Design a binder for this molecule. Structure first.
Ligand SMILES: Nc1nc2c(ncn2[C@@H]2O[C@H](CO)[C@@H](O)[C@H]2OP(=O)(O)O)c(=O)[nH]1
Ligand SMILES: [Ca+2]
Length: 104
C-alpha cells in the first residue's frame, strides 16, 4: 500500500524522506536546480492546514524514484519547513490549472 497517493503515483515514506532531504540540503546551501528554481517558497495559497509552521518550501518528488536534478518536475511535490519538518505531499493532479490538492 502507498503511504501517499498522488493521482496514480504511489509513494512510501522512504521515497518522501529521500526527496525531502535532497530539497532541504539545497535550501540550506542556498542553491537551486531546474528552470523553476527548486526548492522554492511555497506560499500555501490553497490554505492547507499544515500541522508544522511556515515558511514552507516545495521540492519535486518523482515517480521514477530518482531525486530531482532538473528538467520536468512532474506534478508532485514534498513541502517542508525551515526545520526540515514535513508539512505535506501535494500534487497538481486532479486540481485545475496550477493549483494543488493533497496526496492521500
Ligand atoms: N498553486 C500554487 N502555486 C504556488 C504556491 N506557492 C508558490 N507557487 C508557485 O506560484 C506559481 C502559480 O501557482 C507557480 O510558479 C507555482 O510553482 P510550482 O509549480 O513550482 O509550485 C502555492 O501556494 N500554490
Ligand atoms: Ca518508491
Amino acid at each position: 500500500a502507498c503511504d501517499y497517493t498522488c493521482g496514480s503515483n504511489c509513494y512510501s515514506s522512504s521515497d518522501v524522506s529521500t526527496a525531502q532531504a535532497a530539497g532541504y540540503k539545497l535550501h540550506e546551501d542556498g542553491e537551486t536546480v531546474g528552470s523553476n528554481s527548486y526548492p522554492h517558497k511555497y506560499n500555501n495559497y490553497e490554505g492547507f492546514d499544515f500541522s508544522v509552521s511556515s515558511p514552507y518550501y516545495e521540492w519535486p518528488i518523482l515517480s521514477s524514484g530518482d531525486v530531482y536534478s532538473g528538467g520536468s518536475p512532474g506534478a508532485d511535490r514534498v513541502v517542508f519547513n525551515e526545520n526540515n519538518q514535513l508539512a505535506g505531499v501535494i500534487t497538481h493532479t486532479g486540481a485545475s490549472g496550477n493549483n494543488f490538492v493533497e496526496c492521500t
